[PDB]
Amino acid sequence: TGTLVLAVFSAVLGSLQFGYNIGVINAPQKVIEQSYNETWLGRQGPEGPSSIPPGTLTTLWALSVAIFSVGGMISSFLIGIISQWLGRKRAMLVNNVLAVLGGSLMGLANAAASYEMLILGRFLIGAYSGLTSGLVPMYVGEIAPTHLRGALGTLNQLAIVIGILIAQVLGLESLLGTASLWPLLLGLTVLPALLQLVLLPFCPESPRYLYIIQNLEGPARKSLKRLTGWADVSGVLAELKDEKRKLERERPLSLLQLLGSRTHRQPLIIAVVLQLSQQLSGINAVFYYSTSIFETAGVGQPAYATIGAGVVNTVFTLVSVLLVERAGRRTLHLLGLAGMCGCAILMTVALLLLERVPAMSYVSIVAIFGFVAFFEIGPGPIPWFIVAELFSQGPRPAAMAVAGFSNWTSNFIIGMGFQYVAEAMGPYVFLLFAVLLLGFFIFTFLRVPETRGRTFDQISAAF
Numbered sequence: 001t002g003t004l005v006l007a008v009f010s011a012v013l014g015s016l017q018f019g020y021n022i023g024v025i026n027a028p029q030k031v032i033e034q035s036y037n038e039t040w041l042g043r044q045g046p047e048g049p050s051s052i053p054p055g056t057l058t059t060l061w062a063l064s065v066a067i068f069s070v071g072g073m074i075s076s077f078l079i080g081i082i083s084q085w086l087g088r089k090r091a092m093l094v095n096n097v098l099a100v101l102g103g104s105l106m107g108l109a110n111a112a113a114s115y116e117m118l119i120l121g122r123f124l125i126g127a128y129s130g131l132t133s134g135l136v137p138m139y140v141g142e143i144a145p146t147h148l149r150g151a152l153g154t155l156n157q158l159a160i161v162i163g164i165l166i167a168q169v170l171g172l173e174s175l176l177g178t179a180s181l182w183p184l185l186l187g188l189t190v191l192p193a194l195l196q197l198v199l200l201p202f203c204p205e206s207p208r209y210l211y212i213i214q215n216l217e218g219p220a221r222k223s224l225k226r227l228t229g230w231a232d233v234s235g236v237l238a239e240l241k242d243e244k245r246k247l248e249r250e251r252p253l254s255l256l257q258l259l260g261s262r263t264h265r266q267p268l269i270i271a272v273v274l275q276l277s278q279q280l281s282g283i284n285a286v287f288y289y290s291t292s293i294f295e296t297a298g299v300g301q302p303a304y305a306t307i308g309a310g311v312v313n314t315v316f317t318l319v320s321v322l323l324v325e326r327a328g329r330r331t332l333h334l335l336g337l338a339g340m341c342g343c344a345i346l347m348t349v350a351l352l353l354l355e356r357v358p359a360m361s362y363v364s365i366v367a368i369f370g371f372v373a374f375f376e377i378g379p380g381p382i383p384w385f386i387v388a389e390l391f392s393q394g395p396r397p398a399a400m401a402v403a404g405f406s407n408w409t410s411n412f413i414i415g416m417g418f419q420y421v422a423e424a425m426g427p428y429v430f431l432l433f434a435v436l437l438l439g440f441f442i443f444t445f446l447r448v449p450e451t452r453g454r455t456f457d458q459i460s461a462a463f
């Protein structure tokens with residue numbers, strides 16, 4: 001079994017870096033922005049304006065978080081080709097090389113007196129995160145024995161969320177996230193990539209990719225022997241043999257085929273809109289600008305309350321793993337969307353009514369926590385399950401590629417536009433999210449069937 005824990009450890013490390021990179025921009029903002037100002041002052045000359053014009057600064061710092069989503073977008077198309085050509089292990093190793101390059105470019109921003117280097121570093125780390133999000137679930141679910149596949153499935157979520165929380169707690173003013181040690185945060189996100197790069201080559205290749213694609217038999221037999229610790233593994237090998245034959249029985253569809261194929265259309269629309277529901281809900285607005293939101297809202301020590309948001313995220317992800325197994329699929333999405341809309345309305349009421357009673361700033365805090373909480377029940381995991389259960393073994397690759405691309409593009413939209421929207425509208429930002437949620441809730445209530453424990457024949461015939 002040891003081989004199994006080691007391999008899952010490497011995959012989880014990749015996922016944990018994904019989480020770190022998602023969450024590490026919320027706390028250091030007011031410091032990182034300052035650096036930009038300083039650098040932008042140094043390149044003007046004698047008659048300069050003595051300050052970076054606010055618009056230029058807001059746009060630079062918004063790019064510095066949307067470029068990550070651009071990296072993910074470019075990933076979503078590539079997840080398949082490298083997986084098929086190199087495999088799972090080799091893809092992750094090349095991926096770690098790209099990760100080190102991107103993070104190193106991130107961390108050397110201060111010395112270079114350049115804000116382009118950090119933007120490019122975010123692009124590279126975004127491509128990393130896209131590929132590793134694509135390639136960790138595949139591998140862990142690939143190797144894990146039949147019974148434990150469900151349990152090892154959720155390790156990716158715990159990993160990502162713990163990574164986010166670690167990033168948020170390392171951005172405090174007493175800890176790394178300070179005036180002169182912020183780039184070392186980005187160096188830190190470099191660091192675990194080396195540990196994974198030096199640990200993985202001591203782990204086995206996915207038997208399924210070694211049998212179904214490469215046609216190889218003996219190496220797969222050795223890998224199974226060295227993974228499961230069984231005297232005889234004939235049954236599993238035969239099962240994958242018939243799996244290869246079934247895959248040959250119905251070859252997968254190309255992306256354009258899926259897009260233009262009438263029969264597989266309506267489920268494709270459901271997948272796309274559920275991803276848009278996960279993202280345009282506004283969760284990434286919280287994960288990226290919690291500190292800014294709180295400081296606007298009258299909180300005393302915004303970084304601490306952001307840590308609170310991260311801890312709520314972790315706790316309710318644990319609850320989600322322990323609950324989703326016994327609740328349904330549409331039901332949890334509905335409940336999460338409704339709770340999130342209510343929490344956004346409460347946030348708007350708290351911001352609007354802050355002047356009249358300052359001691360109500362605390363209310364804002366709880367609202368956001370509720371928000372995050374109600375996101376990790378309904379719209380956090382459920383969209384991916386619904387995407388999985390709406391498609392047979394044939395067209396899953398293309399369907400997942402489309403869902404992921406839509407997810408990343410909507411993430412870019414929210415991450416780039418939140419600053420401008422908040423500046424323009426003011427305390428009303430969250431009202432907008434509330435409206436979206438309600439809108440989407442309508443859709444989800446009356447357009448997505450319940451897929452829990454429902455036969456693929458029943459699912460398809462329902463449409």
Ligand SMILES: C=C1[C@@H](C)[C@H]2[C@H](Cc3ccccc3)NC(=O)[C@]23OC(=O)/C=C\[C@H](O)CCC[C@@H](C)C/C=C/[C@H]3[C@@H]1O
Binds near residue numbers: 157380381404405
């Ligand atoms: C707020 C977000 C962050 C915080 C996560 C969030 C929590 C989560 C994490 C892991 C699985 C399911 C839910 N819920 C997500 O969906 C999350 O993460 C992923 O989707 C990660 C990997 C997936 O297995 C493959 C798809 C990976 C990408 C194609 C999509 C990534 C989504 C992010 C999301 O931006």
Ligand SMILES: *[C@@H]1O[C@H](CO)[C@@H](O[C@@H]2O[C@H](CO)[C@@H](O)[C@H](O)[C@H]2NC(C)=O)[C@H](O)[C@H]1NC(C)=O
Binds near residue numbers: 034037038050051052
């Ligand atoms: C951009 O950075 C400069 C330099 O720190 C800021 O200018 C200083 O601002 C203070 C007030 O906060 C003035 O009293 C100082 O005299 C300014 N420095 C100099 C050298 O004149 C500027 O305010 C910053 N602006 C933003 C938006 O960050």
